[model samples]
Target: EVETFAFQAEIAQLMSLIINTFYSNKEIFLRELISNSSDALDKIRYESLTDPSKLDSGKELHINLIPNKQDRTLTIVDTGIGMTKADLINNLGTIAKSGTKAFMEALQAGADISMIGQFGVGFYSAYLVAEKVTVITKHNDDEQYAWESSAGGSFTVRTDTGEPMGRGTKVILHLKEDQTEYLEERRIKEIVKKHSQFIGYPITLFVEK
Candidate 1:
């Protein structure tokens, strides 16, 4: 049930939009990811309502931000509905279905380029700061794997062969030289407090300086 597949034009278009449209608002990257994590958690919680087996019995949902200064790594871990292999390939490699579809409709309607691709593909905004992005994820009772990319128009995937998180995902962001501002502890707290204060789950920050 695992195999490699080609990509979509909408994905290329999404990439273009992210780099060209939102390039200046790099700080918004944190908010976008936090929002995405919340959506994923909501989906699993909704599913577990009908079938409690969808999630671990005693698992609590939350988000963790661990900043590593020496390594310049910003790791975000979430206990939510993690991805299956297919989900990883599809979601990461392709543009969001609704995003792509809506973008096309907007263009056909002669809408401004600024109105294109509103929601999805915000995940790719990671490139706003990170030089290398790695996603390690696992679903309940499934094998954990990782997807690695430099955001240089190519990415690769393989079995994670790493530590276990029970069920969830951990995203590692290797910051670039000019983006070192993200490695600051106080800056992170400010961003989280500002954008994630009202989020349903607790957002914890850990920094060693």
Candidate 2:
């Protein structure tokens, strides 16, 4: 079953600002996403320390970038602590509500939290290059779900019945016609090497054939 939710007034405005004005170099979208995936991986590692069950067996902790030229989509997959439906709604649906920020402020005060969500709106940078975005995720504590939007005033969430995901999140970006440069492996490799060179998890790019 799928349901729609309207963006809050502030979120709608922030969406516009982010897509149109916030980021000048749109390529930073990849960097922001890599940072987010690293954060999620960090969360799972931390959680599994206390509760070993939190770690999903067989799914190695890493990030994979898949660029599908045939479909004109770029995918970022992370084997990490996935989000629940409520997590998606609250995190992606609202602006300036960064989990990284809260983690530093409320939980790990003054800790060496090398998180990149300092701006708190990096996810929306996807809209700079992607006309549509889809997030499919599965958490150990919750069923799988897909959250989708077109940078519009509203978005949708549905029980995922498509591709099989083990644990963690897969973010698919339907690249805009003008932003097709991202579909090139060379370009993506360049961006990753330049921006996220030392990300904790191995950032792998699928070889294009």
Candidate 3:
């Protein structure tokens, strides 16, 4: 039989360090998340070149940014390769990836650190400007799930109550008062083009009236 190990206290401390220090620039959070989505779209496009069945024909590989001023929330959605429950737990919960550990080690070892592009830390960047964050994801092989977290170090995962809307992911950021700039359509679009214009995927800006 095989055994699984639990995260050490040091690991939690590392996670806190990453959340606090790695995402110090609030604007970069949008860039990182959008870049990750672009990577996912690239992955699916690469896969579809050989495996046509893997593509979501109904949806294009696109990224959309929607801001709700009434609710003070900014939502970003992507029609890309979605994640499964295990992916949610492993990717979000543990620092199990070697690249993450290596990056942290390099940071600890005093590496220049500006060259790193790992985005496992991107999700945590939401805490920089959001009091609460919610993610709704539907994967091709699994049921839809909702993951909710506050900056308070704990998160809850639950089955989604809404109908599954194809295979993709949606993230809602309950923006803080100071973060209201993200709610403006012009500002958000400008940021998207500034950071992700060369992302190789069609990024759309959606505003709710």
Candidate 4:
């Protein structure tokens, strides 16, 4: 069994609001996730060029999409810096970052909601389409950890023992019945081009034969 964590009440409500109302188009789910992957790749690439010893040569800086129609699931993988268990809980479960809290305070003080997206809340966009999202991530500074959440009230984080992906992170979305359109290859590509075309890294969609 995996170790678990609970979300703070405010964070849970905020996450629900983001999942239910923030995104107008469901297809943008892929776009948001890929954008995050691109960021991760950018971080590792920069670090590796300057500090090669910290890099994992086995993992390339790429984004991969694996669609399993049979299971109605889509998996997005990236060979970038992953998160440790604490990082997963604090990063995914709550807004432990001081910037997030400060952003919230600004909103309470009349800051526009438009700027919330600019404060690094992009990762929460995953909850928009996924009923359950599993993030298996491995960081260079720590052991591999898995973060799972259903977006209702709580999330779980635990040490991972499954086959490792060398380095980086993989996010598996078990799609809801109405959100299955993301499993389509053409749709995924279009979204990628629309939102992430200018990303510095290459994104690949893997077809399971």
lDDT (CA) per prediction: 0.73, 0.79, 0.70, 0.75
Which model, 1 or 3, shows the larger lDDT?
1
Q: Lowest-lDDT window of 10 residues in candidate 4? A: 91-100
Q: How does each model score on TM-score?
A: 0.82, 0.86, 0.81, 0.85
Work out how many backbone clashes candidate 1 has: 0
Error of 2 at 194 (Å): 1.0
lDDT by residue (tens digit), candidate 3, 61-173: 88888889999988888887777877666654335455456767778687533324562555655666787888888777788888776544456677887766587788899
In candidate 2, what are the lDDT values of residues 5-53, reduced to their tens digit?
A: 9876656665675566533478888998888889889988988888887
Pairs of colliding residues, candidate 4: none
User: Of 2 and 4, which scores higher on TM-score?
Assistant: 2
| Each model's Cα RMSD | 3.5, 5.6, 4.6, 3.0
Q: Candidate 3, which segments miss by more than 4 Å at Cα?
A: 1-15, 18-24, 92-100, 105-116
RMSD of 1: 3.5
What lDDT tens digits, residue by residue, belong to model 1 across residues 146-194? 8877643556678876887777778898998888888788999888887
Sorting all predicted structures by lDDT, with the top scorer first, yields 2, 4, 1, 3
lDDT of 4: 0.75
Query: Which candidate gets the maximum TM-score versus the true structure?
Result: 2
Q: Could you tell me which 10 consecutive residues in candidate 3 have the lowest summed lDDT?
A: 1-10
Clashes of each: 0, 0, 0, 0
lDDT of 1 at 160: 79
lDDT of 4 by residue, 3-28 (tens): 76677766676577666665456665
